[PDB]
Amino acid sequence: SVKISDDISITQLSDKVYTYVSLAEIEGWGMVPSNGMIVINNHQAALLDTPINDAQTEMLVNWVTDSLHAKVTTFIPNHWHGDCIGGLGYLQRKGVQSYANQMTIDLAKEKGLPVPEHGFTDSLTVSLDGMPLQCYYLGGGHATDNIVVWLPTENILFGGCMLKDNQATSIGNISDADVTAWPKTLDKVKAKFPSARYVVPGHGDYGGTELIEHTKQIVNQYIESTS
Numbered sequence: 464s465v466k467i468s469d470d471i472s473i474t475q476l477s478d479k480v481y482t483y484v485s486l487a488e489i490e491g492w493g494m495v496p497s498n499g500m501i502v503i504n505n506h507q508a509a510l511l512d513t514p515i516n517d518a519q520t521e522m523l524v525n526w527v528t529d530s531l532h533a534k535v536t537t538f539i540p541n542h543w544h545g546d547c548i549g550g551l552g553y554l555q556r557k558g559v560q561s562y563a564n565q566m567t568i569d570l571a572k573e574k575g576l577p578v579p580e581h582g583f584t585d586s587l588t589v590s591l592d593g594m595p596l597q598c599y600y601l602g603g604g605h606a607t608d609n610i611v612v613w614l615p616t617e618n619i620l621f622g623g624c625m626l627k628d629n630q631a632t633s634i635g636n637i638s639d640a641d642v643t644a645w646p647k648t649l650d651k652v653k654a655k656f657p658s659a660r661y662v663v664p665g666h667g668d669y670g671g672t673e674l675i676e677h678t679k680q681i682v683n684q685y686i687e688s689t690s
């Protein structure tokens with residue numbers, strides 16, 4: 464897992480898909496690592512999630528063009544939080560097409576954060592010059608608006624923060640969470656992607672379909688331990 468900046472790390476999953484980790488500070492959670500994917504095809508790139516701010520995003524945007532040689536033309540945020548659209552204003556200054564759950568659009572609009580330009584309400588298949596990018600909203604989880612991005616041709620699933628990493632014992636940040644739904648939503652994820660080769664969570668190490676089960680448990684536990 465190479466470093467490309469003092470705060471930005473990259474790992475390669477396939478010839479077309481990459482995952483990055485950007486280290487940032489958050490009042491109340493300290494030094495914390497946020498993930499996002501980068502998908503390439505015929506010199507064009509789609510960016511899923513952006514570091515929490517415009518600076519880290521820009522660095523990341525140039526590394527892509529400089530190292531992978533690709534114009535970043537597409538953006539899809541997991542949900543309305545800082546570690547998903549934190550640098551969208553930058554992307555906008557540079558004419559990037561934005562796509563998102565319609566509820567993510569409404570939430571950013573009323574809190575005066577940059578707004579993506581096209582919402583979907585159930586699913587959106589976005590084409591990066593040929594290669595499909597399937598976005599689905601299967602119910603609330605970590606956040607009411609959270610989606611997952613599926614890659615039919617790489618069997619790679621970007622789960623976002625509704626999925627926790629294998630070493631996580633804590634449910635963590637449930638301030639906008641929809642705990643009532645979270646458990647029904649995870650089942651829908653496992654049922655829809657039995658064959659996923661790679662699964663990337665919003666924070667932490669990636670892996671296989673077992674992060675879905677690991678998370679279903681951390682949550683069920685929380686529903687009981689507090690009930």
Ligand SMILES: CO[C@@H]1O[C@@H](C)Cc2oc3cc(O)c(O)c(C(=O)O)c3c(=O)c21
Nearest residue numbers: 489492495624631633634635636665666
């Ligand atoms: C629990 O997992 C992670 O490990 C601990 C040590 C620190 C941490 O901080 C977070 C802070 C957030 O702003 C946030 O939105 C989440 C969140 O996704 O819930 C996380 C998160 O993931 C984790």
Ligand code: NA
Nearest residue numbers: 498499512513
């Ligand atoms: Na990110």
Ligand SMILES: [Zn+2]
Nearest residue numbers: 544605606624
């Ligand atoms: Zn979040």
Ligand SMILES: [Zn+2]
Nearest residue numbers: 546624665666
């Ligand atoms: Zn998160």
